[PDB]
Ligand binder design. Structure first.
Ligand SMILES: CSc1nc(Cl)c(C=O)c(Nc2ccc(S(N)(=O)=O)cc2)n1
Ligand SMILES: [Zn+2]
Length: 256
């Protein structure tokens, strides 16, 4: 199966998932000087006040914090988007070292990690249907740099010991994802894809300009997770990021 190792990593994915070499793959490098300010772009509407988190799962690639998406509870609208997108899960990508881990890069700069808040377009009724549509998903990407701790991240960090290995889950109710946002909602946006198999070209990417700061201890604890299942040799869950892909025939737009 696909993963992040030398034998099953990003360079291999195209064999099972030929769309890996497609026309709108993610992530990409964001060249800040080439991104054009689009005055037609609206402010981003992030409405997470009624978010209902349920569970946290180690899926063998990262960990997902899952939400109740059976009602309009936590929704993303505005910005480049037409309509309403429901929050289904968030997860992170991170490195073995503070100098790598993000999927998107900014003028080739790699951040220590990247948070993805995954939302699906309600006009398609469910997530499975949404991923089959060019405008099916909106993923809000937020960079993490190492510095001061992010207090709103600590509840996530502290539960990781209970989901160390692939397939483990834990109850994760009453988590407020508003605590993971930076101050500014200034963003870049472009049409792209899922950054893991199946690599479907169904995502409007919205990447925030302002990173959040997390502590070295917080990211250290991400790095204690395992790709492997319980009772299997330990493979630390690190470097679970896909490199920047060719921009091809795309423009990145800036809201600012
Ligand atoms: C990771 S296993 C996996 N498998 C399947 Cl079958 C799907 C189906 O959609 C999926 N979703 C997914 C959602 C968001 C992102 S990202 N990194 O672009 O935000 C990547 C994968 N992930
Ligand atoms: Zn992701």
């Amino acid at each position: 199966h696909w993963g992040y190792g030398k034998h099953n990593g990003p360079e291999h994915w195209h064999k099972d998932f030929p769309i890996a070499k497609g026309e709108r793959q993610s992530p990409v490098d964001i060249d800040t000087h080439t991104a054009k300010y689009d005055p037609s772009l609206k402010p981003l509407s992030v409405s997470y006040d009624q978010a209902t988190s349920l569970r946290i799962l180690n899926n063998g690639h990262a960990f997902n914090v899952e939400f109740d998406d059976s009602q309009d509870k936590a929704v993303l609208k505005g910005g480049p988007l037409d309509g309403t997108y429901r929050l289904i899960q968030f997860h992170f990508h991170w490195g073995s070292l503070d100098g790598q881990g993000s999927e998107h890069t900014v003028d080739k700069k790699k951040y220590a990690a990247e948070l993805h808040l995954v939302h699906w377009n309600t006009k398609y009724g469910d997530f499975g249907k949404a991923v089959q549509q060019p405008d099916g998903l909106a993923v809000l990407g937020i960079f993490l740099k190492v510095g001061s701790a992010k207090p709103g991240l600590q509840k996530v960090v502290d539960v990781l010991d209970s989901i160390k290995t692939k397939g483990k889950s834990a109850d994760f109710t009453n988590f407020d994802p508003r605590g993971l946002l930076p101050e500014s909602l200034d963003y870049w946006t472009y049409p792209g894809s899922l950054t893991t198999p199946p690599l479907l070209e169904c995502v409007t990417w919205i990447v925030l300009k302002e990173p959040i700061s997390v502590s070295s201890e917080q990211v250290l604890k991400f790095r204690k997770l395992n790709f492997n299942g319980e009772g299997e040799p330990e493979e630390l869950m690190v470097d679970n990021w896909r490199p920047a892909q060719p921009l091809k025939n795309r423009q990145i737009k800036a809201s600012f």
